[PDB]
Amino acid sequence: LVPRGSHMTIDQWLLKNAKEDAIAELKKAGITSDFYFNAINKAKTVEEVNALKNEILKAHA
């Protein structure tokens, strides 16, 4: 888990953890694109992170 700073709501913390987990999954699949990682980092909901991640994996499969 990304640990949670005092600066950070639970909601923000869960979103940051989803982003990190998605990027880790992309890396496991051989994606090395910062452009794609940045898109995940700009996402505003966990579902957007999931959808970005899933589409990249599908495109790369």
From Swiss-Prot:
Lineage: superkingdom: Bacteria
Subcellular location: Secreted, Cell wall
Sequence segments annotated as region (GA module): 9-61
Record function comment: Binds serum albumin.
Protein name, per record: Peptostreptococcal albumin-binding protein
Source organism (scientific name): Finegoldia magna (Peptostreptococcus magnus)
Taxonomic lineage of the native organism: Bacteria, Bacillati, Bacillota, Tissierellia, Tissierellales
Residues of the full protein shown: 213 to 265 of 387
